[PDB]
Amino acid sequence: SLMIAYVHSATIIVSDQEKALDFYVNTLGFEKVFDNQLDPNMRFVTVVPPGAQTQVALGLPSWYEDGRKPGGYTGISLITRDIDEAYKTLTERGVTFTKPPEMMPWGQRATWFSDPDGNQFFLVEE
Amino acid sequence: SLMIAYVHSATIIVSDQEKALDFYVNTLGFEKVFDNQLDPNMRFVTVVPPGAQTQVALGLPSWYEDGRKPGGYTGISLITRDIDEAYKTLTERGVTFTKPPEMMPWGQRATWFSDPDGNQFFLVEE
């Protein structure tokens, strides 16, 4: 056995789990996976790109003791197979991008977008 | 096309990229993927569990302007197929765990462990 099979999930911090679900599911096209009370103070909620392995947990500041809050660079990079389409349709859907897709000096087109809380993702064409 | 196909990577903050590569590769069994000097100040380094899709970027505090430092809860959960063996082996390799694996009230066995910089992961048996 491998020590580690895969990354289950990474976490972002949001201000409202229900509103975040609406955004990730209806705007970004993810699917909800977890939505479970692990205890009375944690509603464990995750979303996943359709058909993908690794999930994103939609956490709250209250989950944590160190003051982590929504907004800023998430350190999460996302892949799309058609960045021109993603940019067009996500812009139509009201997503905030920094600029249109642009060629990076490692040979892939990319841009950045944010969720409603200001969490920023790097979006890269496969 | 999907708006978003999959999560490429999530980022942790380490103190020393070469020491962290040693840990993730030789202690945890990940494989190095990226190791690319994007600019004189940004060495983009990633690791992946063998065979898995989403990577972990081994970032530095210098990557960010917001004062983020190594250590604490990463928000990253990891799956193993044999937690007893992982716990045993990793313990032998000097990894710090909070407790031995135990049954969570959602019906899976899990524990927490730390990398050398104190970054904490939740480890769950598939």
Torsion of CA B12, B61, A45, A111, to 10 degrees: -100
- Buried-exposed string B18-54: b where 16+ CB fall within 10 A, e elsewhere: eebbebbeebbbbeeebeeeeeeeebbbbbbbeebbb
Nearest by Cα to B28 from B8, B12, B7: B12
C-beta separation of B18 from A66 below 8 A: no
* A121: Cβ contacts below 8 Å, ≥ 6 apart: A74, A76, A77, A78, A112, A113, A114, A115
From CA B78, how far away is CA A4, in angstroms rounded?
A: 7
- The SS3 of residue A54 is coil
- Find chain B residues with C-beta within 8 A of A90's C-beta: 3
Deposited experimental method: X-ray
How far is it, in rounded angstroms, from Cα B59 to Cα A48? 24
CATH code of residue B89: 3.10.180.10
For residue A77, what is the enclosing H or E element? Answer: strand A72-80
Report how far residue B47's alpha carbon sits from residue B69's, in angstroms, rounded to the nearest whole number: 19
Q: Which residue of A has its CA nearest to B84?
A: A3
How far apart (Å, rounded) are the C-alpha atoms in residues B10 and B55? 7
| DSSP symbols for A5-32 | -EEEEEEEE-S-HHHHHIIIIIIT--EE
State how far the Cα of A116 lies from the Cα of A12, in Å rounded to an integer.
Answer: 12
Give the count of beta carbons closer than 10 Å to the beta carbon of residue A26: 10
Q: Cα separations (Å) of A73 from A41, A70, B19?
A: 26, 10, 24
Q: What residues of chain B lie within 8 A of the CB of A10, using their CB?
A: 7, 10, 54, 74-76
- CA trace torsion B110, B116, B120, B126 (10° rounding): -30
Mention every residue, 6+ apart, whose C-beta is less than 8 A from residue B82: A1, B125
Subunit contact A4:B36, Cβ cutoff 8 A: no
Are the beta carbons of B7 and A49 separated by less than 8 Å?
Answer: yes
DSSP 3-state assignment of A63?
A: helix
* A56/A75 Cα distance (integer angstroms): 12
As given in the structure block, the two tokens for residue A84 are: 């021109």
- With beta carbons less than 8 A apart as the criterion, state whether A19 and A116 touch: yes
Angstrom distance (rounded) from CA A35 to CA A94: 26
Report chain A's C-alpha Rg in angstroms.
Answer: 15
Q: Is B77 left (phi over 0), alpha (psi -120 to 50) or beta?
A: beta
Write the DSSP assignment of chain B as a string of letters. --S--EEEEEEEE-S-HHHHHIIIIIIS--EEEEEEEEETTEEEEEEE-TT-S-EEEEE-GGG-SS---S-EEEEEEEEES-HHHHHHHHHHTT-EESSS-EE-TTS-EEEEEE-TT-EEEEEEE-
- Which DSSP category does A40 fall into? T
Q: How far apart are CA A31 and CA A9, in angstroms?
A: 14
Q: How far apart are CA B66 and CA B68, in angstroms?
A: 6
- Resolution, given in Å to one decimal, reads 1.5
Q: Containing domain of residue B122, as a range?
A: 1-126
Q: Residue holding tokens 């209806």?
A: A26
Our CA-based measurement puts residue B24 at a distance from the nearest CA of chain A, in whole angstroms, of 10
> Based on the structure, what is the number of domains in chain B?
1
